UniProtKB/Swiss-Prot annotation, chain A:
Subcellular location as annotated: Nucleus, Nucleolus
Further comment found in the protein's record: Present with 2840 molecules/cell in log phase SD medium.
Protein name per UniProt: DNA-directed RNA polymerase I subunit RPA190
Recorded coiled-coil stretches: none
Known role: DNA-dependent RNA polymerases catalyze the transcription of DNA into RNA using the four ribonucleoside triphosphates as substrates. Component of RNA polymerase I (Pol I) which synthesizes ribosomal RNA precursors. Besides, RNA polymerase I has intrinsic RNA cleavage activity. RPA190 and RPA135 both contribute to the polymerase catalytic activity and together form the Pol I active center. In addition, subunit RPA12 contributes a catalytic zinc ribbon that is required for RNA cleavage by Pol I.
Residues of the full protein shown: 687 to 735 of 1664
Record family assignment: Belongs to the RNA polymerase beta' chain family.
SUBUNIT field: Component of the RNA polymerase I (Pol I) complex consisting of 14 subunits: RPA135, RPA190, RPC40, RPA14, RPB5, RPO26, RPA43, RPB8, RPA12, RPB10, RPC19, RPC10, RPA49 and RPA34. The complex is composed of a horseshoe-shaped core containing ten subunits (RPA135, RPA190, RPB5, RPO26, RPB8, RPB10, RPC10, RPA12, RPC19 and RPC40) where RPA135 and RPA190 form the DNA-binding cleft. Outside of the core, RPA14 and RPA43 form the stalk that mediates interactions with transcription initiation factors and newly synthesized RNA.
Domain of life: Eukaryota
From Swiss-Prot, chain D:
Upper lineage: Eukaryota, Fungi, Dikarya, Ascomycota, Saccharomycotina
Source organism (scientific name): Saccharomyces cerevisiae (strain ATCC 204508 / S288c) (Baker's yeast)
SMART domains: RPOLD
Protein name according to UniProt: DNA-directed RNA polymerases I and III subunit RPAC1
Cited HAMAP family: RNApol_arch_Rpo3
Miscellaneous note of the record: Present with 13000 molecules/cell in log phase SD medium.
Subunit annotation: Component of the RNA polymerase I (Pol I) complex consisting of 14 subunits: RPA135, RPA190, RPC40, RPA14, RPB5, RPO26, RPA43, RPB8, RPA12, RPB10, RPC19, RPC10, RPA49 and RPA34. The complex is composed of a horseshoe-shaped core containing ten subunits (RPA135, RPA190, RPB5, RPO26, RPB8, RPB10, RPC10, RPA12, RPC19 and RPC40) where RPA135 and RPA190 form the DNA-binding cleft. Outside of the core, RPA14 and RPA43 form the stalk that mediates interactions with transcription initiation factors and newly synthesized RNA.
UniProtKB/Swiss-Prot annotation, chain G:
Transmembrane residue ranges: none
Cross-link Glycyl lysine isopeptide (Lys-Gly) (interchain with G-Cter in ubiquitin) per UniProt, renumbered positions: 90
Subunit structure: Component of the RNA polymerase I (Pol I) and RNA polymerase III (Pol III) complexes. Component of the RNA polymerase I (Pol I) complex consisting of 14 subunits: RPA135, RPA190, RPC40, RPA14, RPB5, RPO26, RPA43, RPB8, RPA12, RPB10, RPC19, RPC10, RPA49 and RPA34. The complex is composed of a horseshoe-shaped core containing ten subunits (RPA135, RPA190, RPB5, RPO26, RPB8, RPB10, RPC10, RPA12, RPC19 and RPC40) where RPA135 and RPA190 form the DNA-binding cleft.
Localisation: Nucleus, Nucleolus
Listed name of the protein: DNA-directed RNA polymerases I and III subunit RPAC2
UniProt miscellaneous comment: Present with 8680 molecules/cell in log phase SD medium.
Record keywords: DNA-directed RNA polymerase, Isopeptide bond, Nucleus, Phosphoprotein, Ribosome biogenesis, Transcription, Ubl conjugation
Role this protein plays: DNA-dependent RNA polymerases catalyze the transcription of DNA into RNA using the four ribonucleoside triphosphates as substrates. Common core component of RNA polymerases I and III which synthesize ribosomal RNA precursors and small RNAs, such as 5S rRNA and tRNAs, respectively.
Organism: Saccharomyces cerevisiae (strain ATCC 204508 / S288c)
Transcription listed as a keyword: yes
Highest taxon of source: Eukaryota
UniProt similarity note: Belongs to the archaeal Rpo11/eukaryotic RPB11/RPC19 RNA polymerase subunit family.
Principal location class: nucleus
Coverage span on the entire protein: 45 to 142 of 142
A molecular function GO annotation: DNA binding
Gene name as annotated: RPC19
Swiss-Prot record, chain H:
Compartment(s) of residence: Nucleus, Nucleolus
Function of the protein: DNA-dependent RNA polymerases catalyze the transcription of DNA into RNA using the four ribonucleoside triphosphates as substrates. Component of RNA polymerase I (Pol I) which synthesizes ribosomal RNA precursors. Besides, RNA polymerase I has intrinsic RNA cleavage activity. RPA190 and RPA135 both contribute to the polymerase catalytic activity and together form the Pol I active center. In addition, subunit RPA12 contributes a catalytic zinc ribbon that is required for RNA cleavage by Pol I.
Subunit structure of this chain's protein: Component of the RNA polymerase I (Pol I) complex consisting of 14 subunits: RPA135, RPA190, RPC40, RPA14, RPB5, RPO26, RPA43, RPB8, RPA12, RPB10, RPC19, RPC10, RPA49 and RPA34. The complex is composed of a horseshoe-shaped core containing ten subunits (RPA135, RPA190, RPB5, RPO26, RPB8, RPB10, RPC10, RPA12, RPC19 and RPC40) where RPA135 and RPA190 form the DNA-binding cleft. Outside of the core, RPA14 and RPA43 form the stalk that mediates interactions with transcription initiation factors and newly synthesized RNA.
Protein name, entry field: DNA-directed RNA polymerase I subunit RPA135
The organism's place on the tree of life at top rank: Eukaryota
Family under the similarity heading: Belongs to the RNA polymerase beta chain family.
Native source organism of the sequence: Saccharomyces cerevisiae (strain ATCC 204508 / S288c) (Baker's yeast)
Length: 49, 46, 44, 304, 69, 58, 98, 287
């Protein structure tokens, strides 16, 4: 997942204003692959979920 | 393949047959009901 | 004329204590005809 | 880095065809997020005029009233949606339908038996009088100041042969219909578009050369304008990557499971906008990029 | 019962094409595949409206309570 | 009884209308069919309730 | 009452803040999310619908600093405006040539 | 508006079932897209039945009998029509001068359906609509009594019609036992869409197939789509296919001659995000 896709799947399920988060700010992870362009593996979706 | 019987389905909707009915196989589905009441009045020995 | 014979489709009226039958054939079922009135619909 | 001048260099439009109803055109180097945002407006949020309130005075026909009212609502009306404004729903019915908000349509048709029909006829157009009610029988009645601004163009339906009802003698239909604006998110009758959707440009990538007698069977597994054979050497190439329906027929044959792959150009959209009749498909897409600009402009000025 | 205006999938106006279709099957002796293509019905959602319309209103209309018989 | 499907329409019934049913108080009733033992054939039957006709019944 | 800053999700610094837009579908929320993820100061951004049967739309914007989350939203609405002003011009330049 | 099926047995046209249409051909995609259709549920395109997809009505008839409280020639105390008392002018709207309702009037709960004058109380009582679902009055019969002496009317049959637009929670089904209620009339711009431009007006889950093993619905999808393209109907009376001529091969080679996929699939896109989906989505029309 690219960075626009990665941050869309997290806010589509957390939504901090309904109090599903515990930090009042969505924290993320560094991507799995830095070069040539950043990508997040789908393991790492549920890691930050 | 089958066929859509358009221009025959449509013509039979406009004017029904003045002779005997189309689809005679539907009339044989109730002959054990129709022909059973017809035996009460007609047939052999009255 | 507010009624229709169900048999012969002749339109007719029906006064007080009058017999329910068509004046043209002895049929006992009258159909109340539809008089022109506003009926408001939403086209949905 | 992204900029509005970097997008202005890479974006271009490649228009294929025009017609009074259908327009085929392309958007290059634009996102799927924006190209979907244009077709979601063309179906749902671009206005059109359709019949919403139908006022039956008499209906003794076989098709009942809410269904016959529903069919008048689905009739497309050839009228410019810019010629009249929006209604306010909270206003009462005396003050809501003004002549700047509402076009009135009437349908008065009576059926009677034709005594001059030939013997043994079957055709109901000759055996009866006014037996079929069409969309052209919806007569336009201008009220107020719209007898002048619609004198140049009356409200005729876009498809005048739409069969509304069928009648037998003795039966009649008498109604009035107030048609107003609305969007396709409200009801399907306000979408001014038959269909508006994109397919992305397919990318037929021949990996290994298909020279020989396998270039008549590789050509057969596509639409005929897609693959051609080269003249200077017998060699299948891509003539036009637009004409292919993505059928993946080459993947059924194990001969071509190494020599070709079927990708997709991820930013070359092919819009196919088909108008229902009220507007040109040039104008619907032109409104839909104006609706999205005004939609972001409304949030830019509203206080947070 | 009667021909549907504006087919159920895309929204193409279809209801003006019933009486032309029966003209293009009886007078012009065509099969159903060519007649749906000549009327401009290309998408198969549009094609299954005129191909599979029953037109059952003609069977309803022979019960007219407003005329003698 | 012998009406054409034209004549069944003119007598308001239905064109290909099959009968079979009684009309009772405006309601279309139907007497069902029952499956039942064949006529005129004596079939050998083992039932434990034949023993309960008294003593020594098999 | 069209745009509304959700006070229980905003930050005191102003860098992180949620927004709630009434009667907006995926049409604007996906287009606005793409344009402001092109900003090299936005850290997090995404849109979400709380329930499809209610015409509501939430949008998160979190940024690295040196800009508030409202000032990011105002830039992304300006640049989604200008992106619709160049797809309007080139479609007009090709329909005049035709 | 019923339709005749694309995919039908040869016994269908032999029993005259075209006289009685019981459903409609629907563009059915077998896709997990929605999230609202898992166990047995299913969705409709919203703009499908804004156009009249699957619309139906319900007719309900009650008999208003004014002569069931007396016996043997005693004078009738209850007459249809209005009297001379001060009865409220509110119910001239629903009722005619003879105490009968008009044809086509919209009647919700509490509205009068007939007015009758009484003699033992000297007051016009109305009978009212004892149902919480609103209706329209379609026809009013006058059931006259048959006797040697002629009698004023005491029995009137009134028929209602009720608009049953397909709401969500209504059960639809296929011709293979795939029942299920409707979840949400999903909007057209949010539905998936093919490259041809169409959108499926029914979504069924692919998880309704493996435990149920209704492979006859997968092959009605091929046979339905390959028939609407060529304008033909295919017979589907059973055991016309062997194990050597599979109908996946019969209706597959018809879809290849039209330019569509052999396996019944189509490239589809999402309505929400607008992206190319992974695999070609399995579509086609079933009844
Ligand atoms: Zn009479
Ligand atoms: Zn269509």
């Amino acid at each position: 997942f690219t960075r626009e896709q990665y941050q869309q799947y997290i806010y589509g399920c957390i939504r901090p204003e309904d109090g599903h988060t515990t930090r009042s700010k969505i924290v993320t992870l560094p991507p799995t692959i830095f070069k040539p362009y950043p990508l997040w593996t789908g393991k790492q979706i549920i890691t930050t979920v | 393949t089958a066929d859509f019987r358009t221009l025959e389905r449509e013509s039979r909707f406009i004017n029904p047959p003045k002779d005997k009915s189309a689809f005679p196989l539907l009339q044989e589905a109730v002959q054990p009901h129709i022909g059973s009441f017809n035996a009460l009045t007609e047939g052999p020995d009255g | 004329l507010k009624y229709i014979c169900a048999e012969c489709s002749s339109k007719l009226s029906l006064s007080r204590t009058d017999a329910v039958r068509c004046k043209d054939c002895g049929h006992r079922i009258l159909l109340k005809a539809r008089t022109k009135r506003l009926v408001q619909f939403e086209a949905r | 880095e992204w900029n509005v001048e970097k997008f202005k260099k890479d974006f271009e439009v490649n228009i294929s065809s025009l017609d009074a109803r259908e327009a085929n055109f392309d958007l290059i180097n634009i996102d799927t997020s924006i190209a979907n945002a244009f077709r979601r407006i063309m179906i749902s949020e671009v206005p059109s005029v359709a019949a919403e309130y139908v006022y039956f005075f008499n209906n003794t026909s076989v098709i009942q009233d809410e269904v016959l009212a529903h069919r008048i609502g689905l009739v497309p009306l050839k009228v410019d949606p810019d010629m009249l404004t929006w209604v306010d729903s909270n206003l009462p019915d005396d003050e809501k339908f003004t002549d700047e908000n509402t076009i009135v349509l009437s349908l008065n048709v009576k059926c009677t038996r034709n005594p001059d029909a030939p013997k043994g006829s079957t055709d109901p157009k000759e055996l009866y009088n006014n037996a079929h009610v069409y969309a052209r029988d919806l007569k336009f009645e201008p009220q107020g100041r719209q007898s002048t601004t619609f004198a140049d163009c009356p409200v005729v339906p876009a498809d005048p042969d739409i069969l509304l009802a069928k009648l037998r003698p003795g039966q009649e239909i008498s109604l009035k219909a107030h048609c107003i604006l609305g969007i396709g998110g409200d009801h399907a009758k306000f979408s001014p578009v038959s269909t508006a959707s994109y397919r992305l440009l397919p990318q037929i990538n021949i990996l290994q050369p298909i020279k020989g007698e396998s270039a008549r069977r590789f050509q057969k597994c596509f639409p005929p304008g897609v693959i051609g054979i080269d003249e200077g050497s017998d060699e299948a190439y891509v003539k036009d990557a637009r004409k292919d329906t993505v059928s993946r027929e080459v993947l059924r044959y194990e001969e071509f499971a190494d020599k070709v792959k079927l990708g997709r150009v991820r930013n070359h959209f092919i819009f196919n906008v088909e108008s229902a009749g009220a507007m040109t498909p040039e104008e619907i897409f032109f409104k839909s990029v104006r609706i999205l600009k005004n939609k972001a402009e409304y949030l830019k000025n509203c206080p947070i | 019962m009667i021909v549907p205006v504006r087919c159920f999938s895309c929204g193409k106006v279809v209801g003006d094409k019933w009486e032309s279709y029966l003209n293009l099957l009886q007078e012009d002796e065509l099969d159903e595949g060519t007649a749906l293509s000549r009327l401009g019905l290309k998408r198969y959602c549009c094609r299954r409206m005129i191909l599979t319309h029953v037109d059952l209103i003609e069977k309803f209309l022979r019960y007219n309570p407003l005329e003698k018989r | 009884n012998k009406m054409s499907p034209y004549e069944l329409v003119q007598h308001k019934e239905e064109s290909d209308e099959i009968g079979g049913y009684f009309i009772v108080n405006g309601i279309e009733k139907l007497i069902r069919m029952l499956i039942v033992q064949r006529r005129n054939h004596p079939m050998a039957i083992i039932r434990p309730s034949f023993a309960n006709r008294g003593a020594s019944y098999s | 009452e069209k745009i509304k800053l959700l006070t229980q999700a905003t930050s005191e610094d102003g860098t992180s803040a949620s927004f709630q837009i009434v009667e907006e579908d995926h049409t604007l929320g996906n287009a606005l999310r793409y344009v402001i993820m092109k900003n090299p100061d936005v850290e997090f951004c995404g849109y979400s619908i709380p329930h499809p049967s209610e015409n509501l739309l939430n949008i998160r914007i979190q940024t690295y600093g040196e800009t508030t989350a409202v000032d990011a939203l105002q830039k992304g609405l300006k640049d989604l405006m200008d992106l619709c002003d160049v797809v309007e011009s080139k479609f007009t330049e090709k329909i005049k040539s035709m | 508006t019923g339709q005749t099926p694309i995919v039908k047995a040869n016994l269908y046209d032999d029993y005259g079932m075209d006289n009685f249409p019981n459903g409609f051909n629907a563009v059915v995609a077998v896709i997990s897209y929605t999230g609202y259709d898992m166990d047995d549920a299913m969705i409709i395109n919203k703009s499908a039945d804004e156009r009249g997809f699957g619309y139906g009505t319900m007719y309900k008839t009650e008999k208003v009998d004014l002569a069931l409280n007396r016996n043997r020639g005693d004078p009738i105390t209850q007459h249809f029509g209005f009297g001379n008392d001060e009865w409220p002018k509110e119910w001239l709207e629903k009722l005619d001068e003879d105490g009968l309702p008009y044809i086509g009037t919209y009647v919700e709960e509490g509205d009068p359906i007939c007015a009758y004058f009484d003699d033992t109380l000297n007051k016009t009582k109305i009978k009212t609509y004892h149902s919480s679902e609103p209706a329209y009055i379609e026809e009013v019969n006058l059931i006259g009594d048959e006797s040697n002496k002629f009698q004023e009317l005491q029995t009137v049959s009134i028929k209602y019609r009720i608009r049953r637009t397909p709401q969500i929670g209504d059960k639809f089904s296929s011709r293979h036992g795939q029942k299920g209620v409707c979840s949400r009339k999903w909007p057209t711009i949010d539905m998936p869409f093919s490259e041809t431009g169409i959108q499926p007006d029914i979504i069924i889950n692919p998880h309704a197939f493996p435990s149920r093993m209704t492979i006859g619905m997968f092959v009605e999808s091929l046979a339905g789509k390959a028939g609407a393209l060529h304008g033909i109907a295919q017979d589907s009376t059973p055991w016309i296919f062997n194990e050597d001529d599979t109908p996946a091969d019969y209706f597959g080679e018809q879809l290849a001659k039209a330019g569509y996929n052999y396996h019944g699939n189509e490239p589809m896109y999402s309505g929400a995000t607008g992206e190319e989906l992974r695999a070609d989505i399995y579509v086609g029309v079933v009844y």
